[PDB]
Design a protein around this ligand. Structure first.
Ligand SMILES: CCCCCCCCCCCCC/C=C\[C@H](O)[C@H](N)CO
Lengths: 296, 245, 245, 49, 245
């Protein structure tokens, strides 16, 4: 390197320059004693919101305050305190006579977007990285517990999915499987982080395949292959048909949680899984309304 | 001091005399990928001055009844100059950005704009109006190109989320009373070290008039809005043929 | 630096962006009475934050043909809040004051006001017009309350003294070309350490337009004037029943 | 006095703060030699009444 | 800081609040003649405060169709006060100068002027229009006095030289958008230490509107231009009778 453009160059600097840093903060900030002020040139109240930053005025600048020692804890607003609570994420029905799953087996694609209460919580951020904990509660349509043997198999993507109650894929020589009774307490296991990326993403702005994107290939927009973790399969262990109808409910609880890049929370009703679609005719405001702005 | 500014990168320069400081998104500057983060083995190319310079896309007119517009990045620059040629010759892409929005008027005009950057801005549909039809937006709406696209329901941001919470994203205001420009610097935002520039869009730029434009009859009625941007710390890898689609 | 200011006392705040410094009357700040000066034996009460805060009295309109107004202190505040209750429950009173006058217009309006403080501003009469009748002004003119009173002969200040020498008193100007506020700080002025707040008035506040208001037809014709004041270092002693008259 | 509002309080200060002070002046002030000035930023003539 | 200025010399003062710094011609200040340069034996006279002070000549109106004006130095001051009396009583003369040009308007007017100083500004004629007649300008055009003279062909500066190269001379601009005054300081310029004030003119002052004046109907249509000057370091020698011609 001889020319004095390469020596002085900043190309190749891989270190991130951070303007800010994190500080310990176990409790809320205290309030100190302040008195009256009568001066020119110091205006804590006057701000400029066009800059794009929040107001830096404090309690002591605007009014006269007293000394208060704040010991309120901030430990309930962390991510593990907010997300490590189990919620319903799926439901599987195994009826005797019906059209959905009459043959005694069912397949469920692993997804979180099926129910609104957990979907709205998880869609506050763009990227998320966590471990899981799945609990399976099984019973009859009326809630009664009956003697029966069940099998749950986890099928990673690419593995052959069972096609019948007596399929050869139920030998589970490689895939993990669980044998449990309906008289036992609900089964629960642990799940790692399996994404090929560094974090799950709930919003993907793009197409997964190359080539022209026509109108008959529009169902591929927004589909991220890195979130497709496989299939959950269930059957009644036997050769003949079972005697009772069954219902299975799945609850999942996160742990070891990290999150990035917050975004506005959902405003309208949900319509489809993995789709931000909303009802065009009925758009409702975020909150309530009143008759006049000058009254209550 | 904070009102006058100059931005110099490459062979282009921007001068302004009415500014409101520079926002550095998420408190981080653009930088190159480190050896620990990198996964591909081939060495990337860094053309430097030929791709990191200011580009101007188009001019849009502000009316008394405007809704808003949005652009997709880096979809705007995939057809412009050496950056476009490099992006459509290689497979992998990474870079930061610097965004400058300009809009000027007189001392008798009034108005306000919100300029925000939202990563992974997915667009939804009105679902036929009743929520019964599972439709998807056409390719024109998802990636409009360098001409942008106009919002239909700015209150829900065309995606079902409120606009009143868009300030959580890196943003500025253009108040015709105070300033006439907005500058935002964005690092590379993704869950992967490299990605395709023809299949993935990193973020989107939103310009929505919160307070409507007004003026008395006799003043100039044409109030244009112009967008200028410049890549920062661009990297390419995976050389092959040139594909456009 | 000298243009922008903020005044904080008690639980009230005032912000201005067009000022001409703060006048401290007679080069002295308000303070409490010392042991050498004091004469009464009972200890006084100092409620502090509940009485030393900004009060706004009323809004008065500036016309092209206005004469002027005047207010009496502390007669304005004898019916307002905790200060009024304390003043009408006790016998002895002492305090300073801080006066802020506000009046704003556009860059096409013109005018000028003189804001002055005159201790012991005794009001005379026109003596029937011939000097033969020895009349005295009614109680309405002497102590007009919080509504103020309008001058009849501003040239003689309604007391037989020229207005052109009123600048010898602590004063400021409100020139619509330059500023839009005036701030004056007054200590306790009297020949006694304590006095009654219901029988004696320490001083008076005068607002007289020396240069008349003017503007072209089409601009805003309503130009209000608002008065804001705050006691400083208030003291009360001699507790008894509550008398209002 | 324990609460840190009474300790820091300015209540009870009976001393008068004076901005100005009196100086001896038995005779009128003198006049010194001055010359021409041609500069920017110094304007003794321009005032604000 | 650079906008406000004050100029004090003698018993006169000039105050301005819209300026663009002071030009010192050729990077040199006026000074007195040294012993090595001097040739005459008699000692000169230096009246000082009575001749080095500001003089105002006349007021000229700027129209939408003006061409330009020019003045000759020191021919303007040969009839004004003690400087004129000294100049017409003595034979030899030397001094510097300070020139201040004033022209003010509103924020809705536009225009531009070029104020330049050209040493030895000889005036030519149009040679009858065909170049055949060898005429010479009358005494009125060569030395117009304190009333000045208006240019006939401003493009050639009435001397056959382009105006676009006049910026090589000490000069300033009066842009109605930016400033309203121009100040230039000139030392003594000649190939001799002393010279006659009645036969020789050292330089000339040019005021030419490059960008025409414009305004909307209803604003003030009278825009005057005033010239103020002051000799610096004046010297006279060779006392005799008083001659005027
Ligand atoms: C007997 C074992 C049964 C195992 C039950 C299923 C375990 C597999 C869980 C995979 C990881 C869960 C998280 C999945 C990814 C994202 O959360 C969703 N795709 C979002 O739509």
């Amino acid at each position: 390197d001889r020319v004095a453009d390469v020596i002085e160059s900043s190309i190749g600097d891989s270190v991130s320059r951070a303007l800010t840093h994190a500080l310990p903060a176990p409790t809320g900030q205290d309030t100190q004693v302040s008195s009256h002020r009568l001066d020119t040139g110091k205006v804590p109240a006057l701000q400029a919101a066009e800059i794009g930053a929040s107001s830096n005025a404090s309690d002591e600048s605007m009014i006269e305050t007293r000394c208060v020692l704040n010991s309120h804890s901030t430990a309930e607003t962390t991510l593990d305190s907010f997300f490590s609570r189990a919620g319903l994420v799926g439901e599987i029905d195994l009826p005797l006579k019906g059209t959905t799953n009459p043959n005694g087996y069912a397949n469920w694609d692993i997804d979180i977007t099926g129910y609104a209460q957990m979907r709205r919580k998880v869609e506050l951020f763009t990227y998320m990285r966590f471990d899981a904990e799945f609990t399976f509660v099984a019973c009859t349509p009326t809630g009664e517990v009956v003697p029966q043997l069940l099998q749950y198999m986890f099928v990673p993507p690419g593995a052959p999915k069972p096609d019948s109650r007596e399929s050869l894929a139920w030998q589970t020589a490689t895939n993990p499987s669980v044998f449990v009774k309906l008289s036992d307490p609900p089964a629960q296991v642990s799940v790692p982080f399996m994404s090929p990326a560094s974090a799950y993403q709930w919003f993907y702005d793009g197409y997964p395949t190359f080539g022209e994107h026509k109108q008959e290939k529009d169902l591929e927009y927004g589909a991220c292959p890195n979130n497709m973790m496989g299939t959950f399969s269930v059957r009644t262990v036997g050769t003949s048909k079972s005697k009772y109808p069954l219902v299975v409910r799945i609850y999942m609880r996160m742990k070891h949680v990290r999150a990035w890049i917050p975004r506005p929370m959902r405003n309208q009703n949900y319509l489809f899984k993995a789709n931000p679609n909303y009802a065009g005719n009925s758009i409702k405001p975020t909150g309530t309304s009143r008759t006049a702005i000058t009254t209550l | 001091s904070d009102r006058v500014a100059q931005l110099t990168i490459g062979n282009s320069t921007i001068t302004t005399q009415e500014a409101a400081n520079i926002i550095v998104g998420y408190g981080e500057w653009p930088s190159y990928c480190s050896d620990s983060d990198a996964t591909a083995v081939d060495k990337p190319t860094r053309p430097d001055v030929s791709v990191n310079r200011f580009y101007t896309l188009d001019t849009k007119l502000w009316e008394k009844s405007s809704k808003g517009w949005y652009w997709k990045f880096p979809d705007v620059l995939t057809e412009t100059g050496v950056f476009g040629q490099n992006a459509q010759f290689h497979y992998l892409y990474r870079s930061g950005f610097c965004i400058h929005v300009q809009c000027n008027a007189s001392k008798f005009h009034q108005g306000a704009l919100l300029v925000a950057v939202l990563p992974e801005y997915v667009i939804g549909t009105v679902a036929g109006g009743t929520g019964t039809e599972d439709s998807h937006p056409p390719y024109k709406q998802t990636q409009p190109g360098a001409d942008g696209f106009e919002l239909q329901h700015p209150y829900v941001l065309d995606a079902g989320i409120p606009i009143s919470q868009l300030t959580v994203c890196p943003h500025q205001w253009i108040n015709l009373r105070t300033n006439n420009c907005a500058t935002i610097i964005v690092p590379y935002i993704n869950a992967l070290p490299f990605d395709s520039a023809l299949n993935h869009c990193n973020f989107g730029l939103l310009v929505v008039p919160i307070s409507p434009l007004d003026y008395d009859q006799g003043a100039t009625p044409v109030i244009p809005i112009t967008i200028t941007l410049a890549p920062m710390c661009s990297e390419f890898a995976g050389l092959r043929q040139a594909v456009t689609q």
